[PDB]
Amino acid sequence: KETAAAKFERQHMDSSTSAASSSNYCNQMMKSRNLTKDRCKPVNTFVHESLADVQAVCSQKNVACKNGQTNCYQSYSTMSITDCRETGSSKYPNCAYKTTQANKHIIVACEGNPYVPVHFDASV
């Protein structure tokens, strides 16, 4: 019964690569992490930093979440991330994605004890 923290790791963590290795990165990853199961997940971001560094964001800059909640935090430093965006030619079950690497600050929502990331809110 996958916890919210575990789901965050599956959907957004990829410390294996330092950046978007290939143009087919998203196509493979979105499928590998089961984000193309029930449908082609429109957009998803992967963070290429250590889990410790990502979890540490929960003790960083407190900012408002997009839904109005106040438990979001923005990283003090930029982080290596890869944004995956569904193409127009993409048709389930053959989900196609556009891979885009970048260095941006991330914003995550944190909850629980231990206080850890449970939702990826944005990249800035």
What determination technique applies here? Answer: X-ray
Domain map of the chain by residue range? 1-124
Report the distance separating Cα 72 and Cα 117, nearest Å. 9
Report the distance separating Cα 10 and Cα 46, nearest Å. 9
Any known ligand binding at 37?
no
Report the distance separating Cα 81 and Cα 106, nearest Å. 9
Any known ligand binding at 43?
yes
Any known ligand binding at 98?
no
Catalytic residue, from 25, 54, 119, 120: name it.
119
Task: Please tell me the CATH code under which domain 1-124 is placed.
Answer: 3.10.130.10
Q: Is 105 a catalytic residue?
A: no
